[PDB]
Structure 1
Amino acid sequence: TLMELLNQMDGFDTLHRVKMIMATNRPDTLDPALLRPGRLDRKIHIDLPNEQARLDILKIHAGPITKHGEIDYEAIVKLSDGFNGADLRNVCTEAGMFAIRADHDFVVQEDFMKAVRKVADSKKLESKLDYKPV
């Protein structure tokens, strides 16, 4: 079933306006014949957010949130080390959870850092997150 792909990717019949997008987690477990250029042209590398990236995504999820004019995104990023976009999304979720705690419809800044501590604590179970390309 894979060799059908290998054929009908390059094979005899060429292709036109047919774009192939592939997604994975570890490239190391793939077939080199599939990994050679021509079939799989370019390998785009995605990595964890930098500091500015973390600040940006944080601002992204931070938009539609009933809060106060008190948000220190910078400190949260400072405690923010290696977290997925879904991770920061998790932070925004948990901070709202603490807000539901005590039933304060607004959002205080401290619940942010608390949720950051919780989520960051939760990452004591994820090892081997990197994989060599190819």
Structure 2
Amino acid sequence: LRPGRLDRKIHIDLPNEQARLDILKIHAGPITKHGEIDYEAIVKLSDGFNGADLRNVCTEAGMFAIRADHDFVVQEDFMKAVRKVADSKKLESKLDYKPV
């Protein structure tokens, strides 16, 4: 643990508001949808999100389209998704605490 085998300690830490904004556009890119401007809603709502959670909301939203009977994602479905995953993760047990 002591340097000289781990001199560089780089921590790939939890992606920002700004970071989530650009990554969601890319994620938005294969998604067949009515439209999405909802990026701003998604980031504000997101709390403790990491990369895996970000990909998840995009999948969770598309899943709600299937219930709707549409292959196009509603704006309502992205908003529904962020809140839901956010709620489940925190309530059950929160992330691992370790040096940052």
Structure 1-normalised TM-score? 0.65
Distance 1:117 1:53 in 2: 19
Q: Which runs of 5+ in 2 are unaligned?
A: none
The one of 32, 50, 53 aligned to 1:66 = 32
Asked if structure 1 preserves the Cα contact closer than 8 Å seen for 2:35 and 2:74, the reply is: no
Q: How many Å apart are 1:126 and its aligned residue?
A: 5.4
Cα separation, partners in 2 of 1:42 and 1:102, compared to 1, 3 Å: same
- In structure 1, stretches of 5+ residues that fail to align are 1-34
Describe the SS at the equivalent of 2:63: helix
Rounded to whole Å, the distance in 1 between the matches of 2:45 and 2:94 is 22
- TM-score normalised according to structure 2 size: 0.85
Which structure dedicates a bigger proportion of its chain to helix?
A: 2
Question: Structure 2 vs 1, CA of residues 132 and 115 (structure 1 numbering), >3 Å: closer, same or farther?
Answer: closer
| Offset of residue 130 of structure 1 | 4.6
Contact 2:35 / 2:75 at 8 angstroms: preserved in 1?
no
Alignment RMSD: 2.0
Judged with a 3 Å threshold, the aligned counterparts in structure 2 of structure 1 residues 86 and 128 are, in CA distance, closer, same or farther, namely closer
Percent sequence identity is 100
Larger radius of gyration: 1
Residues 14-43 of structure 1 deviation map (CA, whole Å, 9 limit, x = unaligned) = xxxxxxxxxxxxxxxxxxxxx222122211
Aligned residues: 100
Is the 1:66–1:107 Cα contact (8 Å) retained in structure 2?
A: yes
